[PDB]
Design a binder for this molecule. Structure first.
Ligand SMILES: CN(Cc1cnc2nc(N)nc(N)c2n1)c1ccc(C(=O)N[C@@H](CCC(=O)O)C(=O)O)cc1
Ligand SMILES: O=c1ccn([C@H]2C[C@H](O)[C@@H](COP(=O)(O)O)O2)c(=O)[nH]1
Length: 287
């Protein structure tokens, strides 16, 4: 009945069977297919959070709220128990990326900064950037509200001039939104998708963001189209993914929002309620 999660599982099956064995930039073995497309229903509250292995929902929500704040300080995420960016903000990683003058935790002008302060001069994580640069997130909300049929509703983190300053170049590269029949849909272009760890997290993240924007704009939700460039499995995840592929998906959970939420900046962890998410046991996959 959850045919959408079966699509994700079939993508993994296709990569394991047909993918090319390539060593990546780190020397890590991967199995890769270039160019994959899948569609997930977001209708009637549904968020595509995989049921065949637990997704780090606490991490998904806190990371997304941190992006929306325009925050690039890994420490602020770590303080909420979410460590997923900590390695990239470490004294070691900063020095190794030639960011020796940066304070620990400073990831540079990554997603949050690009979403809210696009084109502003980055001067470190501790600077207040209020009103500096282009607030893409507010601009796309204004387009959805005033010109819902627009073909120009794009949220991009791929700031070429800023790539050299970023801890990592964006994997979730741009998202396009569209309104049909008072339903908000999203097409996510992901240049690089780790099918084991990254992609399930990223699908949950853009599913949730589409619901949050729809809520602010008084719209229903439609679908999330997921476009992959390098759809890959790490060789060290193959046994774990073979275990997952034996499992039959359950129905995806739904999300609902509580409180008076007027703008994209008014969401809190407590305002977001995930309903009927009881996944199968987590499967450990190393970095
Ligand atoms: C999106 N993201 C950031 C991130 C940064 N660099 C990366 N680099 C690579 N090579 N691959 C990734 N998937 C990756 N992901 C994520 C998302 C989820 C988890 C995650 O589920 N972490 C679990 C631990 C999972 C585990 O490794 O056992 C946790 O409790 O923090 C980590 C990083
Ligand atoms: O949100 C994220 C962040 C990272 N990655 C994975 C994809 C790649 O395996 C790696 C990034 O390496 P490059 O594509 O930049 O080489 O991390 C994701 O899948 N999603």
């Amino acid at each position: 009945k959850n045919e959408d999660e079966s699509k994700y599982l079939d993508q993994v099956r296709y990569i394991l069977k047909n993918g090319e064995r390539i060593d990546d930039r780190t020397g890590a073995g991967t199995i890769s297919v270039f160019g994959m497309h899948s569609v997930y229903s977001l209708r009637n509250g549904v968020v595509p959070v995989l049921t065949t292995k637990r997704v780090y929902w606490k991490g998904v929500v806190e990371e997304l709220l941190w992006f929306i704040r325009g925050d690039t300080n890994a420490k602020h995420l770590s303080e909420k128990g979410v460590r997923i960016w900590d390695a990239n903000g470490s004294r070691q990683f900063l020095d190794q990326c030639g960011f020796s003058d940066r304070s620990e935790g400073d990831l540079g002008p990554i997603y949050g900064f690009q979403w809210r302060h696009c084109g502003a001069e980055y001067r470190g994580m501790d600077t207040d950037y209020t009103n500096q640069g282009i607030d893409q997130l507010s601009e796309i909300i204004d387009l959805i509200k005033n010109e819902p049929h627009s073909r120009r509703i794009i949220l991009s983190a791929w700031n070429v001039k800023d790539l050299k300053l970023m801890a990592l170049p964006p994997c979730h590269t741009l998202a396009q939104f569209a309104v049909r029949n008072g339903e908000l849909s999203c097409q996510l272009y992901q240049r690089s998708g780790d099918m084991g760890l990254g992609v399930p997290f990223n699908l949950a993240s853009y599913g949730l963001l589409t619901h949050m924007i729809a809520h602010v704009c008084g719209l229903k939700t439609g679908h999330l189209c997921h476009v992959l460039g390098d759809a890959h499995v790490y060789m060290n995840h193959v046994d774990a993914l073979q275990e997952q592929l034996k499992r039959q998906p359950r129905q995806f959970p739904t999300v609902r929002f509580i409180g008076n939420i007027k703008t994209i900046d008014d969401f809190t962890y407590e305002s977001i309620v995930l309903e009927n998410y009881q996944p199968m046991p987590a499967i450990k996959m190393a970095m």
